[PDB]
Design a protein around this ligand. Structure first.
Ligand SMILES: [Zn+2]
Length: 289
């Protein structure tokens, strides 16, 4: 475990939570994005913002704000990293049905992904020369949908996959982190990831294995999850995988903190942040020399 600092990654999750819920349209969301952008620029990334007015399933007009951060943007060969940074406006799945109208921190559901990819970004800023381009993409408005309407989620990755920030954008492989910080998390093979990126899924999970993270990266089928990686595979043709906390043996599949007031800084395990983080950076190290 040489290249990735989980303490830094953990602090990055605390800092996002500090603004308050990153609910599209609200002030914290505005502030967090500025700080996201500033922070990425401070790590040497060329940071581009893609904003659009998008209407949600229930007619709310959201100020979508996708954040694209680039290293070596001239390079034709590119590695893609993804995470959603918005917070769902409600803990719809709280054990107490009175909480269903109220907000939660989303430290894992949103925070964790940005936090790891923030700490990767910093590591990138200290690389004298790089052989591939790297795009880190923070999608917005992934968690605003409703449950009976599967294409009301991932609106940010929808918009971006149909209208990338570069004409003919392409990347060799995509990695999406979603809820990678909860204590005791289980990362199984997401079906679409396994289907469209078999070499990618194996290469990552074998890296984890070699690094001794097989208590976290389980080499076995998980779920068929609609996530930000799916639109990217359909519309951009990029083979993507989703490192996401899901188990077929959970009450909700996701961990019990999901869309729950318990999704907060108290649920985050630095060791789980380290496993995902140190795996992805290591896989990224050999793939860009
Ligand atoms: Zn969510």
């Amino acid at each position: 475990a040489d290249l990735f600092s989980a303490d830094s990654a953990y602090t990055f999750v605390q800092r996002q939570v500090n603004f308050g819920p990153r609910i599209p349209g609200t002030a914290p969301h505005r502030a967090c994005g500025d700080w996201l952008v500033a922070t990425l620029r401070s790590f040497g990334a060329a940071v581009q913002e893609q904003t659009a007015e998008i209407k949600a399933h229930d007619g709310t007009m959201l100020p979508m704000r996708n954040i694209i951060a680039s290293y070596r943007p001239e390079a034709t060969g590119r590695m893609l990293l993804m995470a959603h940074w918005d917070t769902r406006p409600v803990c719809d799945q709280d054990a107490n049905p009175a909480m269903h109208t109220e907000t939660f921190d989303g430290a894992d559901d949103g925070g964790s992904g940005v936090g790891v990819l923030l700490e990767i970004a910093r590591y990138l800023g200290q690389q004298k020369d790089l052989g591939m381009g790297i795009d880190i993409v923070f999608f917005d408005t992934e968690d605003y949908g409703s449950y009976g309407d599967d294409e009301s989620w991932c609106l940010g990755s929808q918009y971006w996959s149909r209208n990338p920030h570069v004409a003919g954008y392409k990347a060799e492989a995509g990695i999406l982190l979603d809820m990678v910080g909860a204590k005791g998390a289980t990362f199984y093979w997401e079906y679409f990831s396994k289907s469209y990126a078999p070499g990618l899924i194996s290469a990552v999970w074998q890296t984890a294995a070699a690094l001794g993270y097989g208590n976290y990266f389980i080499q076995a089928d998980g779920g068929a999850l609609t996530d930000d990686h799916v639109p990217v595979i359909k519309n951009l043709g990029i083979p993507c995988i989703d490192i996401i906390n899901y188990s077929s043996k959970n009450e909700h599949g996701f961990g019990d903190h999901w869309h729950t007031q318990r999704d907060n800084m108290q649920i985050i395990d630095k060791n789980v942040l380290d496993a995902v983080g140190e795996t992805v950076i290591r896989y990224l190290d050999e793939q860009v020399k």
